[PDB]
Amino acid sequence: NQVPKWIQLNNEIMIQKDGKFQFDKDKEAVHSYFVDYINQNTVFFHNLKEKLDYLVENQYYEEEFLSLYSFEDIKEVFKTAYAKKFRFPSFMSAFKFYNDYALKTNDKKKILERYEDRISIVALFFANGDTEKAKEYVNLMINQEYQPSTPTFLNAGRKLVSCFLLEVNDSLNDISRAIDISMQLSKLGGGVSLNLSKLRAKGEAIKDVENATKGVVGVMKLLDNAFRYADSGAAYLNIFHRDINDFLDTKKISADEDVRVKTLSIGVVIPDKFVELAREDKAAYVFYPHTIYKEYGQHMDEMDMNEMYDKFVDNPRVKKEKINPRKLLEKLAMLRSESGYPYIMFQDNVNKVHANNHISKVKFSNLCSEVLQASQVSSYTDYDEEDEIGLDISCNLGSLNILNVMEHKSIEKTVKLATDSLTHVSETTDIRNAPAVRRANKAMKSIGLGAMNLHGYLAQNGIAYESPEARDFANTFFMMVNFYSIQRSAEIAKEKGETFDQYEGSTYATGEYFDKYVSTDFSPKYEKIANLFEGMHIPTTEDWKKLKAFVAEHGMYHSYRLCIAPTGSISYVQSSTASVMPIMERIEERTYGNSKTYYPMPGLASNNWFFYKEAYDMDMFKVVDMIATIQQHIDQGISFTLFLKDTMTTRDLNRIDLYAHHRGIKTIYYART
Amino acid sequence: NQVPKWIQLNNEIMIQKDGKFQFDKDKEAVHSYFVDYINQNTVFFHNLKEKLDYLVENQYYEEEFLSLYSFEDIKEVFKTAYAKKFRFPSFMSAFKFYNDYALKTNDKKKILERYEDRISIVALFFANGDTEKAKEYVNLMINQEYQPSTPTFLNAGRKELVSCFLLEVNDSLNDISRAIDISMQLSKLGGGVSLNLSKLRAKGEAIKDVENATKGVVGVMKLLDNAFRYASGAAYLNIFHRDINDFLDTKKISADEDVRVKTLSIGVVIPDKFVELAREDKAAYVFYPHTIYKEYGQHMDEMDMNEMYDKFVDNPRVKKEKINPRKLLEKLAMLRSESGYPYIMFQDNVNKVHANNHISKVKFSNLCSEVLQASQVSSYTDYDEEDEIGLDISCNLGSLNILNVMEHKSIEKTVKLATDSLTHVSETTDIRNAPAVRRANKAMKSIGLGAMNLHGYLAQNGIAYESPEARDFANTFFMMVNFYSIQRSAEIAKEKGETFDQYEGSTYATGEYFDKYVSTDFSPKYEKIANLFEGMHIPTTEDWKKLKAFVAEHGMYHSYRLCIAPTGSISYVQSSTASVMPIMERIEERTYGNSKTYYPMPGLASNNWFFYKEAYDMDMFKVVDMIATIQQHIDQGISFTLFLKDTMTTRDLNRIDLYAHHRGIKTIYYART
Numbered sequence A: 001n002q003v004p005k006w007i008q009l010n011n012e013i014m015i016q017k018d019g020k021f022q023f024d025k026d027k028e029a030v031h032s033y034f035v036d037y038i039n040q041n042t043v044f045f046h047n048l049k050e051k052l053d054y055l056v057e058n059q060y061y062e063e064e065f066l067s068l069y070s071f072e073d074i075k076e077v078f079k080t081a082y083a084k085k086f087r088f089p090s091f092m093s094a095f096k097f098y099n100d101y102a103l104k105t106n107d108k109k110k111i112l113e114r115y116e117d118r119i120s121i122v123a124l125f126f127a128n129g130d131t132e133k134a135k136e137y138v139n140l141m142i143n144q145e146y147q148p149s150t151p152t153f154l155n156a157g158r159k160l161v162s163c164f165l166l167e168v169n170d171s172l173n174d175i176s177r178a179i180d181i182s183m184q185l186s187k188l189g190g191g192v193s194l195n196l197s198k199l200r201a202k203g204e205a206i207k208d209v210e211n212a213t214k215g216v217v218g219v220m221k222l223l224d225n226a227f228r229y230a231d232s233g234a235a236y237l238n239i240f241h242r243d244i245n246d247f248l249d250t251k252k253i254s255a256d257e258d259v260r261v262k263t264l265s266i267g268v269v270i271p272d273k274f275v276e277l278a279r280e281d282k283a284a285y286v287f288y289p290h291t292i293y294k295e296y297g298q299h300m301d302e303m304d305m306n307e308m309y310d311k312f313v314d315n316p317r318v319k320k321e322k323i324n325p326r327k328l329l330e331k332l333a334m335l336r337s338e339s340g341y342p343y344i345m346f347q348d349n350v351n352k353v354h355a356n357n358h359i360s361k362v363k364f365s366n367l368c369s370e371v372l373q374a375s376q377v378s379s380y381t382d383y384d385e386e387d388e389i390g391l392d393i394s395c396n397l398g399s400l401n402i403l404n405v406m407e408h409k410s411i412e413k414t415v416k417l418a419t420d421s422l423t424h425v426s427e428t429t430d431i432r433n434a435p436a437v438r439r440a441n442k443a444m445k446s447i448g449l450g451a452m453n454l455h456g457y458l459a460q461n462g463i464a465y466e467s468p469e470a471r472d473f474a475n476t477f478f479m480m481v482n483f484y485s486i487q488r489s490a491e492i493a494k495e496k497g498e499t500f501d502q503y504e505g506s507t508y509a510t511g512e513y514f515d516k517y518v519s520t521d522f523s524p525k526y527e528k529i530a531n532l533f534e535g536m537h538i539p540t541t542e543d544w545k546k547l548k549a550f551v552a553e554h555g556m557y558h559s560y561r562l563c564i565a566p567t568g569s570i571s572y573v574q575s576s577t578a579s580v581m582p583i584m585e586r587i588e589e590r591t592y593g594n595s596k597t598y599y600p601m602p603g604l605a606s607n608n609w610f611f612y613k614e615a616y617d618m619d620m621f622k623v624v625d626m627i628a629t630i631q632q633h634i635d636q637g638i639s640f641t642l643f644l645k646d647t648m649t650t651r652d653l654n655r656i657d658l659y660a661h662h663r664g665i666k667t668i669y670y671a672r673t
Numbered sequence B: 001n002q003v004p005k006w007i008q009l010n011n012e013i014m015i016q017k018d019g020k021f022q023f024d025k026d027k028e029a030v031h032s033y034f035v036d037y038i039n040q041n042t043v044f045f046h047n048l049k050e051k052l053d054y055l056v057e058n059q060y061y062e063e064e065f066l067s068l069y070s071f072e073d074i075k076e077v078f079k080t081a082y083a084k085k086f087r088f089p090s091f092m093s094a095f096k097f098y099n100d101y102a103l104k105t106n107d108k109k110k111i112l113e114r115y116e117d118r119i120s121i122v123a124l125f126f127a128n129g130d131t132e133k134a135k136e137y138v139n140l141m142i143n144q145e146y147q148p149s150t151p152t153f154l155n156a157g158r159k160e161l162v163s164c165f166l167l168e169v170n171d172s173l174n175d176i177s178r179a180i181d182i183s184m185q186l187s188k189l190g191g192g193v194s195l196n197l198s199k200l201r202a203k204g205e206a207i208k209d210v211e212n213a214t215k216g217v218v219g220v221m222k223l224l225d226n227a228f229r230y231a232s233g234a235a236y237l238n239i240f241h242r243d244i245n246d247f248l249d250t251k252k253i254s255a256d257e258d259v260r261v262k263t264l265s266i267g268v269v270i271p272d273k274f275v276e277l278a279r280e281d282k283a284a285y286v287f288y289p290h291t292i293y294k295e296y297g298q299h300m301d302e303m304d305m306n307e308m309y310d311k312f313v314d315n316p317r318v319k320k321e322k323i324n325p326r327k328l329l330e331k332l333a334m335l336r337s338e339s340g341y342p343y344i345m346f347q348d349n350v351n352k353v354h355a356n357n358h359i360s361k362v363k364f365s366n367l368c369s370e371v372l373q374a375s376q377v378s379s380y381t382d383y384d385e386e387d388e389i390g391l392d393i394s395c396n397l398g399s400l401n402i403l404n405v406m407e408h409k410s411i412e413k414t415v416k417l418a419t420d421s422l423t424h425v426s427e428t429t430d431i432r433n434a435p436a437v438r439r440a441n442k443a444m445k446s447i448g449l450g451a452m453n454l455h456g457y458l459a460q461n462g463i464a465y466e467s468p469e470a471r472d473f474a475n476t477f478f479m480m481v482n483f484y485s486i487q488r489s490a491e492i493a494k495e496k497g498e499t500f501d502q503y504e505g506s507t508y509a510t511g512e513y514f515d516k517y518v519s520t521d522f523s524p525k526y527e528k529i530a531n532l533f534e535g536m537h538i539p540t541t542e543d544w545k546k547l548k549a550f551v552a553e554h555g556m557y558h559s560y561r562l563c564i565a566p567t568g569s570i571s572y573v574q575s576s577t578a579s580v581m582p583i584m585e586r587i588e589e590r591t592y593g594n595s596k597t598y599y600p601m602p603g604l605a606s607n608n609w610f611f612y613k614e615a616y617d618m619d620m621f622k623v624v625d626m627i628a629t630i631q632q633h634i635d636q637g638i639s640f641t642l643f644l645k646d647t648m649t650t651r652d653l654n655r656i657d658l659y660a661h662h663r664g665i666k667t668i669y670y671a672r673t
């Protein structure tokens, strides 16, 4: 019943020694943890050869790519991995990896893969042919300079993408196909979110008889029962719809028995016209979209609300409904004060900066509220009848540490390797049950790259989070990031000579995206910021012009490059902070079982106590301006999370909302208190 | 606010005039009803021609088959229909037809089709070419000698047609998707759809990689219960299964929130081995059927329990579970004492008399608990992968009056016409979303014929319901019915020369079904019974031998012929009793709205008060013996309904259950109290 030694040592840090914390004990706890639990459950082997032979003959490793080299080259790779003599810096830095991510045995009671093992297996998977490139991947990963995404880091060479985005056309057959594909992807563990734009609303005619449709709530009920069957997503909705009130009455603290969704989140799509009507204090008109489909032939949100709203008001054919926008934003503020639900996307900020609006305009987002790409709906006909295949969105992920990049200045080569890595991942991927995801993943070739560790590095260097210097720093940094990113994409496009489809329809072929960079140079405006990037080259606008010419030579290989995800579950292995959202508390406290695990933030010393500010004690406006400065280079959304208090006000909340709409923040997240 | 005249006249019957009822007022109420509500809402026309032209040009009648004759022949058919000068005998005899079944207008406020109209349209639909045959259908129907089934009587020549669907669910994710798809497809067609969950793996079991991963049968029931709420059937289960207790905990008066099915009924399949184990007071062993599928390759209920039960006990591979059968029948008696749920099928009584056991054995039944045919499961593979098509069951229905048959002695010609009618109906049927139903309905060609009006005719003639004379009467009657039925099937088989597939595999080609009729002649054993059939020919066993030879010449066209359904909703139009179940109460009382509609049973006079017995005051054993005498000629099940009282006993209930198992009653129904 006694608590073991390392947990007891980890509980020692809260003892006040001269008003401080016992940080130096922490390593000792880690030095306990590698003696009394880890090195007494590892399966023992003589050397490498039999080890790998035992790993093959019990159905663990996919033996194909592990047969495509010599034994000696793999031995050199493992030798390069063990030559680091790597150590962990913190207590959770081991515990989150040797409990869940690292490979266990069949009885789930022993440990096979060491920390070099998993990384070097990932390295040979990203190699696909070159030994020295695999060594480059090792030197990239073992210095914690790059982190692949969660399911890629898990399921490399065992028995892959955690983000799926679909559309539901309007038929019975379409709803059947949708529930089919959701149950298919549900066992694959990824993130699956739907959208209910083109559906007819409640109390409407079904092809023969008026007032026959049970509406959106029944489809939500079927999906809520549907995800309860397998190993949880969400759904979005554009606001110009009658049942939007019933779409928002689901998340309710006085929850109805039938109106009860504990699985799917919800979210609202809002263009500028509704914002205008809520500002100027006038009426609003939600519609019956099936009447619009009968009238104009197209669907509702496939046209501009700013161009067509009063024209639909003027049409006697479209049956309408008048409501109050201001009371509706008040109700949104109340429901976000309850939890923070739903999600919010401002599409006009997105499409006016989007490159690929010539295919379609972005209407929705994933569960992770980040990926904003084109989407064409399919049409699933009857059994012997053939179908028509639209386009879908499937985004594999991956971020990186800012800190080690700043330590080593190999940011270019880092992007060079990570781009090829995610390229080979999207090469490898295949799904054999949803054909539109198949066609789009072959077609669009969308990769997603981001970064964590913003708060901690700049807080450890002694720069406040609300400083303008950090905003200029992030501006110059992400400018150079996007620069080398497009540079590598153009290089690979020259290597293959095969861009994505309808490349001339993009703004990339015209250089309209490049028109921001031909002027308005992003040189550092502070000396202390300039000392940080001091020691390496920073490009000029003429370098952007040479880049524009080199793009105009061939083109770009990818259609999308960047994403920012709240990668907290693999934040702990990199032993760092979250992404760009600053930290909540200086000390995290968990109870694994009969235990009080005490996690300090990395870099917690006496001097930098003030730069480790608290999330409840910050200017939200400067945070939004930081995220807007970050937004200057990112194609997709940014995982912006609101940090609130009970003492705050929905007046101030909606002021922050309209402030972010005025700045141009794409999406937000669930709010915390 | 005043009650109209005819309802006030209909409420007059409960006034005691010399201790009697005001029967003679009732016709007066009917004579009121054709003056003050019906003949003041009929759309008025000059004559036939413009009438039909107006009916075409507003999308009511399917104009194809109504273009395949002359105008004059249709005029002769309508003239023959109006030449009857038909009247209704009772008050509900109009009210159940001019309120729901007869055709209304688009605003649902006026009446177009008269009572001749609907019948003669059905007549021309059954004609398909011959005017005189249509006149024969008129002379059949307008004397109330035959009644087609409910959706055929509704949707003839309008804007599917068979109210009975039976499916199977193979074991995959894809199969469950296909099952929910087909259920939602048939749900808008309004028919009866019931499933079966035999071949599914049970709760807490391995899903292909990881032990204890299956949520079990309850989640699939939850999905189906949500599924039918969107657009109502049932499902069956064989008892040798671990989750059978959880399969019976759904219908519970102390209902759980999650375990709550207000839509689907449930039912139990029981062979003789479990009956034996419950009698002899020993243990029982339910199984994990996926282990059996891994062991023997086949599925569980595709083999004999009597041959394999102890062999599965002897296998160490099959994981088992020991339970008490006697306490389980006690729990069944308790749950039937709660409501009467679930349903019960004794398959060994069925298969030992079934002709077509060479294809498969019957495992389940429909919602109406009557149709017991073969069923091969399909296998629904992935998207580009092709599937394999099994066999399904789809049974259109139809019964007849016994009374007018006894009045006119045209029983042979009646069967001659009704067989061709249901034949043409099964010709006409097509569904374009469930391919196995398509293939089976083309293949098996199963028709279903029955009869109502057993209790009332023999009660009006002055013969008690519990008499042996009625049992001999029904024996001789249904013997001759089945005789002429097989005679007409052989005639049509000679007409086409194309029997159903695998006809030589049947017992009909071998005459093993005919071996009962070569001896043991069913001559009437009472003089009073013999006077009823007196005046017409009754066949002999040598006539059965000639029938056997004529069958051996060609064969039989159909694989199934007979069914008995509780056709109460179209009992009222024929102005008669139900089918073979005797009546509950002598007077039915309903409240349409602010009203007390008082329905007397037909033939209610002072003399026959005693022969109109009450259902709570009868010998159940003689009822079961009556149904067993009826069972001597019917291939399918019989809609046997239990009539119980609160003063009765589950001891006596289970005694009746085992009594019916000893007699050989196929299925039972929900019990009433």
Ligand SMILES: Nc1ncnc2c1ncn2[C@H]1C[C@H](O)[C@@H](COP(=O)(O)OP(=O)(O)OP(=O)(O)O)O1
Pocket: A030, A031, A034, A035, A085, A086, A087, A088, A089
């Ligand atoms: N933080 C850590 N990360 C990884 N391994 C660790 C960590 N802490 C201890 N160990 C491992 C390494 C060794 O196998 C064992 C402890 O030996 P350790 O003292 O840490 O290495 P070392 O040999 O380089 O130092 P020393 O020479 O002082 O013994 O457990």
Ligand SMILES: Nc1ncnc2c1ncn2[C@H]1C[C@H](O)[C@@H](COP(=O)(O)OP(=O)(O)OP(=O)(O)O)O1
Pocket: A169, A170, A171, A172, A173, A200, A206, A207, A212, A213, A214, B187, B188, B230, B231
């Ligand atoms: N029985 C039903 N109950 C509820 N909703 C239904 C039902 N049947 C169909 N629907 C709903 C969901 C469908 O998306 C929508 C239309 O159904 P569906 O028949 O598949 O469209 P359709 O392609 O045949 O033609 P249309 O565009 O005129 O509706 O109404």
Ligand SMILES: Nc1ncnc2c1ncn2[C@H]1C[C@H](O)[C@@H](COP(=O)(O)OP(=O)(O)OP(=O)(O)O)O1
Pocket: B030, B031, B034, B035, B085, B086, B087, B088, B089
């Ligand atoms: N039970 C009924 N069934 C059908 N129609 C009826 C019924 N009762 C009354 N009517 C109809 C028939 C007529 O159109 C009208 C009533 O006339 P009705 O007296 O019944 O016929 P009738 O003309 O043969 O008798 P009578 O010569 O004595 O008037 O309503």
Ligand SMILES: Nc1ncnc2c1ncn2[C@H]1C[C@H](O)[C@@H](COP(=O)(O)OP(=O)(O)OP(=O)(O)O)O1
Pocket: A186, A187, A229, A230, A231, B170, B171, B172, B173, B174, B201, B207, B208, B213, B214, B215
């Ligand atoms: N994620 C899941 N959650 C619950 N049940 C599942 C899940 N995935 C599959 N199943 C259930 C329902 C399926 O009928 C059953 C097996 O699934 P499935 O993969 O379709 O079978 P299979 O044809 O691929 O091979 P096998 O016969 O070995 O199961 O287990």
